[PDB]
């Protein structure tokens, strides 16, 4: 069906900033597009119905224009409740498609992760499962990528990571990550890394250890 | 396809 | 003041059936061309539309889930339903009812299609979580290690949400990073909580775990090993 890009995924900004959120369709959606902010914790509102009117209430500093294929939001003095995740939606063509969101987070100086591996406890051990985390510890932006690896094996499918909201003082997100194997497969190997890759690092990082080295 | 107030 | 809110079960297990209730107040499904949709936000994911269906009755569905939702309305209880079959983990998400204007009308002809480019008015949203999992109590594991130092407690298979933690009673507070927990395929969720420290308090480090689903409290002082 009927696709829906906005750009940019992700946007840093500072009280009183302009920002701008672009939003594509695949065909044209004449002038049937809303935009929406959502706030963590809560239901998206509506900003700008019809490509470009105002909905009732909304304060003015928000904008929409555009039609067809290509839309715009443009906040005009970004305040602080507009840090917030953005959703387009097209109207047109059933079915009613959104956007994939553009985060708006506050802007800081670039912060490189600090970096830590845990080991599996042996209390988890005796269980039968192993669970090996990695810890990126305030950092910025938020984008992220770990890869885990096993005696230089790349692994795939077998860990989660979730990811702090962005912290109210230092501006900076935490992510953790956990890569859980049987404990049979955990002592088939040595090498368990957390290879991270993240704009404040010159080049990947990559923290390990040796399974049961003591 | 279309919307309910599409063309 | 139109007003919309959510109602069902917070918890469903796979291949069942899953009915959710939009109650509103403020319009009513017999008013000209107004519609009531559905929309589905997985956790820390995009808005994902479901369906809607309109005062004449009209119903549209995402193509992608046709067959397992049906969309009705109740216009005398001001209730629209959406009822999804044979629910698998995915479907876990919070799940919104909107209303959709219909034309504007001036003496009862309608004059403007713009407002109803858009959904105007949410409900609050309801968490749905799909999982087979009794309740069950975490275990909780100890993760031992500019020059800061981490340690934490790795809060494993417990269901359902929530769990509290805290650090020294209460009295840790900062470089605390609790994160959202992430739900297994095995239907338990699980979580990490961490605190950075100078390398040099390691000062002793407990962490207070709570799930009060199970009734289970779990106090767990973490070392930097090596006896």
Redesign the interface.
């Given at each position: 069906?009927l696709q829906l890009t906005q750009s940019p995924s992700s946007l840093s900004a500072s009280v009183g900033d302009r920002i701008t959120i672009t939003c594509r369709a695949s065909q044209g959606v004449t002038?049937?597009?809303?935009w929406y902010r959502?706030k963590p914790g809560?239901?998206?509102?509506?900003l700008?119905?019809?490509?470009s009117?105002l909905?009732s209430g909304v304060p003015s500093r928000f904008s929409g224009s555009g039609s067809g294929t290509e839309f715009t939001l443009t906040i005009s003095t970004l305040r602080p409740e507009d840090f917030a995740t953005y959703?387009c939606?097209q109207?047109?063509?059933?079915?009613?498609?959104?956007?994939?969101?553009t985060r708006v987070d506050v802007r800081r100086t670039v912060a490189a992760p600090?970096v830590?591996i845990?080991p599996?406890?042996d209390?988890?051990l005796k269980?039968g499962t192993a669970?090996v985390?990695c810890?990126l510890?305030?950092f910025y932006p938020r984008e992220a990528k770990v890869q885990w690896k096993v005696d230089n094996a790349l692994q795939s499918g077998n860990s989660?990571?979730?990811?702090?909201e962005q912290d109210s003082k230092d501006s900076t997100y935490?992510?953790?990550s956990?890569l859980?194997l049987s404990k049979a497969d955990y002592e088939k190997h040595k090498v368990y890394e957390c290879e991270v890759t993240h704009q404040g690092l010159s080049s990947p990082v990559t923290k390990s250890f040796n399974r049961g080295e003591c | 396809?279309?919307?309910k107030h599409?063309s | 003041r139109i007003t919309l809110k959510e109602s069902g079960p917070p918890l469903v297990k796979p291949t069942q059936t899953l009915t959710l209730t939009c109650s509103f107040s403020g319009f009513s499904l017999s008013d000209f061309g107004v519609g009531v949709?559905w929309?589905r936000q997985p956790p820390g994911k995009?808005?994902?539309?479901l369906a809607?269906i309109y005062s004449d009755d009209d119903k549209?569905?995402?193509?992608?889930l046709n067959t397992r939702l049906t969309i009705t309305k109740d216009t005398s209880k001001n209730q629209v339903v959406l009822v999804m079959t044979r629910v698998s983990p995915v479907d876990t998400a919070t799940y919104?009812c909107?209303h959709r204007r219909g034309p504007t009308t001036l003496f009862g002809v309608p004059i403007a299609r713009?407002?109803?480019?858009?959904?105007?008015?949410?409900?609050?949203?309801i968490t749905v979580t799909i999982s087979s999992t009794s309740t069950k109590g975490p275990?909780v594991?100890?993760?031992?290690?500019?020059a800061?130092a981490?340690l934490?407690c790795?809060v494993?298979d417990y269901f359902p949400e929530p769990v509290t933690v805290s650090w020294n009673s209460g009295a840790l507070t900062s470089g605390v990073?609790?994160?959202?927990?992430?739900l297994?395929s095995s239907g338990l969720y699980?979580?990490?909580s961490?605190v950075?420290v100078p390398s040099s308090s390691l000062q002793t480090y407990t962490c207070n775990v709570n799930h009060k689903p199970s009734n289970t409290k779990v106090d767990k002082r973490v070392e930097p090993k090596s006896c």
């Amino acid at each position: 069906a009927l696709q829906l890009t906005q750009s940019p995924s992700s946007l840093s900004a500072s009280v009183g900033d302009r920002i701008t959120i672009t939003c594509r369709a695949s065909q044209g959606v004449t002038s049937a597009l809303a935009w929406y902010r959502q706030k963590p914790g809560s239901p998206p509102q509506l900003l700008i119905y019809d490509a470009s009117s105002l909905e009732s209430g909304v304060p003015s500093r928000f904008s929409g224009s555009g039609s067809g294929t290509e839309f715009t939001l443009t906040i005009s003095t970004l305040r602080p409740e507009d840090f917030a995740t953005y959703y387009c939606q097209q109207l047109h063509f059933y079915p009613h498609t959104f956007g994939g969101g553009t985060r708006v987070d506050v802007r800081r100086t670039v912060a490189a992760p600090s970096v830590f591996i845990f080991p599996p406890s042996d209390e988890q051990l005796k269980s039968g499962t192993a669970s090996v985390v990695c810890l990126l510890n305030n950092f910025y932006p938020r984008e992220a990528k770990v890869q885990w690896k096993v005696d230089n094996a790349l692994q795939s499918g077998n860990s989660q990571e979730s990811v702090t909201e962005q912290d109210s003082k230092d501006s900076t997100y935490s992510l953790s990550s956990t890569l859980t194997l049987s404990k049979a497969d955990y002592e088939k190997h040595k090498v368990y890394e957390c290879e991270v890759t993240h704009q404040g690092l010159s080049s990947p990082v990559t923290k390990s250890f040796n399974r049961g080295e003591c | 396809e279309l919307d309910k107030h599409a063309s | 003041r139109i007003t919309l809110k959510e109602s069902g079960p917070p918890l469903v297990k796979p291949t069942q059936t899953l009915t959710l209730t939009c109650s509103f107040s403020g319009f009513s499904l017999s008013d000209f061309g107004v519609g009531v949709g559905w929309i589905r936000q997985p956790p820390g994911k995009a808005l994902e539309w479901l369906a809607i269906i309109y005062s004449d009755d009209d119903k549209r569905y995402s193509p992608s889930l046709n067959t397992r939702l049906t969309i009705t309305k109740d216009t005398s209880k001001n209730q629209v339903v959406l009822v999804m079959t044979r629910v698998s983990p995915v479907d876990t998400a919070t799940y919104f009812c909107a209303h959709r204007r219909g034309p504007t009308t001036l003496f009862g002809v309608p004059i403007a299609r713009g407002p109803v480019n858009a959904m105007d008015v949410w409900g609050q949203g309801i968490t749905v979580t799909i999982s087979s999992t009794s309740t069950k109590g975490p275990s909780v594991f100890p993760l031992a290690p500019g020059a800061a130092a981490a340690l934490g407690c790795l809060v494993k298979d417990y269901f359902p949400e929530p769990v509290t933690v805290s650090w020294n009673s209460g009295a840790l507070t900062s470089g605390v990073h609790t994160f959202p927990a992430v739900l297994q395929s095995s239907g338990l969720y699980s979580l990490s909580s961490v605190v950075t420290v100078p390398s040099s308090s390691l000062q002793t480090y407990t962490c207070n775990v709570n799930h009060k689903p199970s009734n289970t409290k779990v106090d767990k002082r973490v070392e930097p090993k090596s006896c």
